[PDB]
Amino acid sequence: MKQGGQGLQDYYLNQLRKEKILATVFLTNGFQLRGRVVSFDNFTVLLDVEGKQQLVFKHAISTFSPQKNVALN
Amino acid sequence: MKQGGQGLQDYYLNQLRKEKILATVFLTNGFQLRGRVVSFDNFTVLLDVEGKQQLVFKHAISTFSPQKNVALN
Amino acid sequence: KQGGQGLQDYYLNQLRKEKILATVFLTNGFQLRGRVVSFDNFTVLLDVEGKQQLVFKHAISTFSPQKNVAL
Amino acid sequence: KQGGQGLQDYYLNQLRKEKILATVFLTNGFQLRGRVVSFDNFTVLLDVEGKQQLVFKHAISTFSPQKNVAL
Amino acid sequence: KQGGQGLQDYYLNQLRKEKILATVFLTNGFQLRGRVVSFDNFTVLLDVEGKQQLVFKHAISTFSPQKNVALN
Amino acid sequence: MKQGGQGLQDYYLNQLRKEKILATVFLTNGFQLRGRVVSFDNFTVLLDVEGKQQLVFKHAISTFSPQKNVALN
RNA sequence: UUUUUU
């Protein structure tokens, strides 16, 4: 079910989507996006930026900065 | 069939291609392209920018920003 | 054949067969205009005005051809 | 255990257990100073002054810790 | 040989065997002019005027050789 | 044993560690570090920079420039 | 750690 050693990432990205937490996604190119996590697979993350969809590649993502801290285990 | 854990990206890029949606493609190098998806494999995306083809490597792609939101599941 | 790179293996081959001239945009903003001689999974051999150019795919951003490739 | 991530899995864990303070240099020149909360194969979760920061490893350049880690 | 890095393993080999001098353009704009001593899957060992240079392939952008390499 | 086709890199970094050779490590982001290799696994290199430890990811490293040339085979 | 999450 789970897959070896991306527990932390799949969990974190899941809660942000589930808990509708707002986050600032920092891209590597200095650009940033503020919005909510709609969905994600292994290589991409779908964002909702004010009603608009944003398909972002993980290799372009630098940091996830959430407005609310996510509870861990 | 054949998948892996890359459901979200393969479905999304196909719909953009199927629905002939116009999208703004931001590259990692800051450059951007506005056009429509013709085809894609694992590593490249073929784009139609004003009638002209553009073979873009996914590792150069940062975000897909579509004029129309793509239907999900 | 190898799954999930039909499109790239096809496209780069056509540029090579039909001797299409292309502008190769690198990620670092640099660009090269030339013709595809050969390519394998990680590199592209380019012919830039008689000069050979071995380019790594991770450095390539976009392929912009003078002539569109048949689909 | 997993072949040849001995050094990294040990190092990042010690930073987390001993709560060593570290400056994380990103590839884009930006930096973050904080403590390791958790990490998997692709991400490192940081605590920057009470605020969480999910950082992708491909964006990280260097880990510079306030205290040297015992080997 | 191994799976579809034919072109690269051959080219880097000829440059080393035939001692052709090449300019290596790095991604960060930096460049190095020298000769290929050795290489494995992730690194290239370079000779820049007697000095060794271990370059990671992910940092390499382009190989520009002084002499064109025959092909097959 | 265990290898793959990364012969040249594992041998070289080991000798730098074994021979305690001083090296200038150029990062992709232009930064430099002068120090000695303490240890390395597949993705990271632990450096000794003026007595201080530096965990550097290989993907950030561009070139290893050693004060002494390292013996090969 | 050399072609889309170390």
Distance CA F29, CA E40 (A): 24
Distance CA F4, CA D6 (A): 17
Distance CA A38, CA A54 (A): 9
- φ and ψ at D37, to 5 degrees? -90, -45
Q: Are B43 and B58 in contact, with CB atoms under 8 Å apart? A: yes
Residues 4-23 of E with CB under 7 A from strand G: 4-5, 8
Residues sharing a CB contact under 8 Å with residue A18, sequence separation 6 or more, in sequence order: none
Residues sharing a CB contact under 8 Å with residue C47, sequence separation 6 or more, in sequence order: C34, C35, C36, C37, C53
Partners of residue C2 in chain E, C-beta under 8 Å? 3-4
Count of structural domains, chain C: 1
D28, D58, D68: residue with CB nearest F53: D68
B4, B8, B30: residue with CB nearest A44: B8
User: For F49, which DSSP code?
Assistant: E
Q: Per the structure block, which two tokens stand in for E43?
A: 């690194």
**Is nucleic acid strand G under 7 Å from B28's C-beta?**
no
Q: Per the structure block, which two tokens stand in for B56?
A: 């873009």
User: Given a contact as 3+ CB pairs under 8 Å, which chains touch A?
Assistant: B, D
User: Rounded to a whole number, what is the largest CA-CA distance in chain F?
Assistant: 36
- Chain G positions within 7 A of any protein Cβ atom are 1-6
Q: Which of D44, F57, D7 is nearest to A62 (CA)?
A: D44
CATH of the domain at A40: 2.30.30.100
Three-state SS at B20: coil
DSSP string across D3-69: TT-HHHHHHHHHHHHTT--EEEEETTS-EEEEEEEEE-SSEEEEEETTEEEEEEGGGEEEEEESSPP
For the stretch E12-48, what's the b/e string if a residue is b when 16 or more beta carbons lie within 10 angstroms of its beta carbon?
Answer: bebbbeeebebebbbbbeeebebbbbbbbbbbbbbbe
**Does the distance separating the beta carbons of C54 and E11 come in below 8 Å?**
yes
**Is nucleic acid strand G under 7 Å from F18's C-beta?**
no
Residues pairing with E31 in the sheet: E25
From E26's Cα to the closest Cα of chain C, the distance in A is 9
**Does the distance separating the beta carbons of A29 and B29 come in below 8 Å?**
yes
Q: Per the structure block, which two tokens stand in for B71?
A: 């239907």
Partners of residue F38 in chain D, C-beta under 8 Å? 71
Q: Per the structure block, which two tokens stand in for A55?
A: 């398909």
Residues sharing a CB contact under 8 Å with residue B13, sequence separation 6 or more, in sequence order: B37, B40, B45, B64
**Is nucleic acid strand G under 7 Å from B59's C-beta?**
yes
Residue pairs spanning A and D at CB distance below 8 A = 64
User: Rounded to a whole number, what is the largest CA-CA distance in chain D?
Assistant: 34
Q: Solved how?
A: X-ray
D5: number of Cβ within 10 Å: 17
Domain boundaries, position B17? 1-73
Q: Which nucleotide is nearest to F60 (CA to C1')?
A: G1
